[PDB]
Each structure stands twice: as structure tokens, then as C-alpha cells.
Design a protein around this ligand. Structure first.
Ligand SMILES: COc1cc2c(cc1OC)[C@H]1C[C@@H](OC(=O)[C@@H](N)C(C)C)[C@H](CC(C)C)CN1CC2
Length: 374
């Protein structure tokens, strides 16, 4: 059925993101390792995009379990920096495979735009939920048992997920797609695919510049307590969960172009409002708005990728969702380091204001998605 595939993609994304996050609080126990996974995923996304059109979705969505499970074990038994880096790179390839192949399969199964909206919303809700229950899970287990409890529990969990894969997807038989998909070059030459991918990129780059540089600006102006840095962003996750689980539904009613436009403005007018907050209490509302609007944008531009592909090019979703994932991961690849560097160069408030201005100025470019020609 289709709901089984939806649940399998949801659980895959959830477990992959629990892993990306769980590792965060264990690494201090600092260089390019934090972005190794993201940049490796950015490298290996288009390859899965072209591979899903050559061998099918199952085999390259099941290769997620076989690879992420190896990472979750390699992290469980990591001693040197080289082992940690190769484990994070293997995770990155696993997250690629899972995200690209799973979103492509969700697009190829739910062939109606209205239902594809809700399905992509639910999958991104899986992403958000995994990110939300990640740091808790890891820490709790790290403090109560040791540095190997979270990784072994997630190994068991991805093993169960891979069993569901083997007994639902049946990747035993290779199966090429029905028609030759449009080459990635032509897809990237289109203006509307570029606009949607750019919207997702800019939104996620704003978040990924905010997150690892807000504790820095906090410990020097607010003098917040140690645990305050943890709650300083939990509103963003919770709001992203809410937004990307409800707007996958609300967007096709409101109009995906309008949802994305309003989505980015809200991102802009919230990120711009972060530097004006002086105390942790005043930091909540703009962070909530940031998360809510990032969800507004993501759940509304993820269906529109497959929609534009169905409306303009041939109906093969591997390459276009590889493009959208590249958009995503560009943020968590470049944004953290570049934002830290810019904050050290000019200043964190000016960096957040630049991000906000760029987002508010780029938002009106989403009106071009009101009615694209065929
Ligand atoms: C390991 O270290 C990290 C820890 C964390 C992150 C990245 C890290 O490294 C990369 C991101 C993940 C975000 O979101 C996501 O992954 C998802 N949106 C998907 C679409 C990428 C999240 C955005 C929402 C609050 C709006 C913010 N943080 C949470 C913790």
C-alpha cells in the first residue's frame, strides 16, 4: 500500500535525524567534523538522483539502512578523529540515500498534488520530530548509561526500520523506471525549479546560521545560565514540527506560492527581530516565528518540486528531489562556518540582519510560482 511507504519514509527520516543530532552533544566528549556529513550529502545527492532512475527506489532507499546502521555502529566504537570523520561521512551518504530516495518514492506513489502536499508535510514532520527528540534522547542516555547507549539503541531502531524495509519494500529485485528522466542539467536550467530550490536554500541557511551562533552572542550580552542555551532553540524545533505537519495540508488550500511567499517574509521579519531581543524571555517569540515560517516554506515547496516536474518535464522525481535536498544541505554545509566567520568579521546582529534582509527581498520572487506554463 501507500501508507506503509509513507510510514517507512517517516521512520527513515526520523532515525537519520535522531542520529545527526544525538552525535552533537557527544563530540565535545570541533573542526570540519560538524559539517562533514552535510557536505558529503551535498556531494552525493545528485548521484542518488541519477541512480534512482536507473535501479529503482527500493534498492537505493534500503541502502540507507545498510549504511546508516554502519555509521551508528562506527560512532558507537569511535576512538580517534579519523574514525569519527569517516563515521560522519558514512552517515552523510546514508542521509542522502534516505532523504532523496524516500522523497522520490513518496512523490512517485502519491501521484495527486493535493495528497502529495500532506504526504511531504508528514515526511518533513518526521524530519522535524527526529530533530526535536534527538538531543533529549542522546543526553538522557549519555548521562544515565554511557557514551554508547544512544548509538546502540539507535542501531537497534534502524535495524527494526530495515526489517520493515525488507518486508515491505522488497529490494531484492532491481527495476528501472518507466521512462527516461530529464537530465539534471535541464532541471537546473529551469527558472521555477531554481526559484523553489533557492527559497528552501535561503530559509535553511538562515536557520543553520542562527543556531550555532546564537549561543555565542548569548554568552556575552545576556549572561544566560548554562541550561538556558538549550531551551533557547527548542521553540524553533517545536514550531517547525507544528508548521510542517499542518502546512503540508494548509498550503494547497491557501495556494503554495502564497504560502511560500508569506513563509519567507515571516522568516525574514523574525530573524531580523532576533538581535533586538535583550533577554532570554524576549528571544522566544522571534525564534518561534522563525521555526513556524521555515516549516511554512518547506512543506510548501517540497510538493511544488514534483508538481513542477509533472507540469513541465517528464514524471521522474529522483533528480528534482536530489536538487531540493542539495538546497537543503547547502545550509547545514556552508552556513554554520560562514556565519561564524561573518559574525567574527562584522558582527552577529549585522549577520542576522543581512539574512533577514536577503530573505525579505527574495520572498517576492515566489509570486512567479502562481501559475507556471507547461
Ligand atoms: C549535529 O548537529 C546539529 C544539530 C541540529 C541541527 C543541525 C546539526 O548539524 C547538521 C539543526 C537541524 C534543523 O533541521 C533539520 O535538520 C531539518 N529541518 C532537515 C530538513 C535538514 C533545525 C531546524 C528547525 C528548528 C527549523 C535546527 N537544528 C537542530 C539541531
Amino acid at each position: 500500500s501507500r501508507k506503509l511507504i509513507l510510514f517507512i519514509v517517516f521512520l527513515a527520516l526520523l532515525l537519520d535525524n535522531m542520529l545527526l543530532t544525538v552525535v552533537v552533544p557527544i563530540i565535545p566528549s570541533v573542526g570540519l567534523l560538524f559539517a562533514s556529513k552535510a557536505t558529503v550529502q551535498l556531494i552525493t545527492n545528485p548521484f542518488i538522483g541519477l541512480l534512482t532512475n536507473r535501479i529503482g527506489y527500493p534498492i537505493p532507499i534500503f541502502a540507507g539502512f545498510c549504511i546508516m546502521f554502519v555509521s551508528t555502529i562506527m560512532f558507537a566504537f569511535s576512538s580517534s578523529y579519523a574514525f569519527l570523520l569517516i563515521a560522519r561521512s558514512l552517515q552523510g551518504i546514508g542521509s542522502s540515500c534516505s532523504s532523496v530516495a524516500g522523497m522520490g518514492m513518496l512523490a512517485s506513489v502519491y501521484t495527486d498534488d493535493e495528497e502529495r502536499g500532506n504526504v511531504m508535510g508528514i515526511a518533513l514532520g518526521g524530519l522535524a520530530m527526529g530533530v526535536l527528540v534527538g538531543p533529549p534522547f542522546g543526553s538522557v542516555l549519555y548521562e544515565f548509561v554511557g557514551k554508547t547507549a544512544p548509538f546502540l539503541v539507535l542501531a537497534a531502531l534502524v535495524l527494526l526500520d530495515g526489517a520493515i524495509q525488507l518486508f515491505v519494500l522488497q529490494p531484492s529485485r532491481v527495476q528501472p523506471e518507466s521512462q527516461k528522466g530529464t537530465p539534471l542539467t535541464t532541471l537546473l536550467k529551469d527558472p521555477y525549479i531554481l526559484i523553489a530550490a533557492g527559497s528552501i536554500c535561503f530559509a535553511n541557511m538562515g536557520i543553520a546560521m542562527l543556531e550555532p551562533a546564537l549561543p555565542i552572542w548569548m554568552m556575552e550580552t545576556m549572561c544566560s545560565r548554562k541550561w538556558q542555551l538549550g531551551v533557547a532553540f527548542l521553540p524553533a524545533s517545536i514550531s517547525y514540527l507544528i508548521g510542517t505537519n499542518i502546512f503540508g495540508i494548509l498550503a494547497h488550500k491557501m495556494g503554495r506560492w502564497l504560502c511560500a511567499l508569506l513563509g519567507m517574509i515571516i522568516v525574514g521579519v523574525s530573524i531580523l527581530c532576533i538581535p533586538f531581543a535583550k533577554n532570554i524571555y524576549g528571544l522566544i517569540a522571534p525564534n518561534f516565528g522563525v521555526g513556524f515560517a521555515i516549516g511554512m516554506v518547506d512543506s510548501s515547496m517540497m510538493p511544488i518540486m514534483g508538481y513542477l516536474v509533472d507540469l513541465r518535464h517528464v514524471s521522474v522525481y529522483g533528480s528534482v528531489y536530489a536538487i531540493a535536498d542539495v538546497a537543503f544541505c547547502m545550509g547545514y554545509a556552508i552556513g554554520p562556518s560562514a556565519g561564524g566567520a561573518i559574525a567574527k568579521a562584522i558582527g552577529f546582529p549585522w549577520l542576522m540582519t543581512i539574512i533577514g534582509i536577503i530573505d525579505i527581498l527574495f520572498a517576492p520572487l515566489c509570486f512567479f510560482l502562481r501559475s507556471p506554463p507547461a
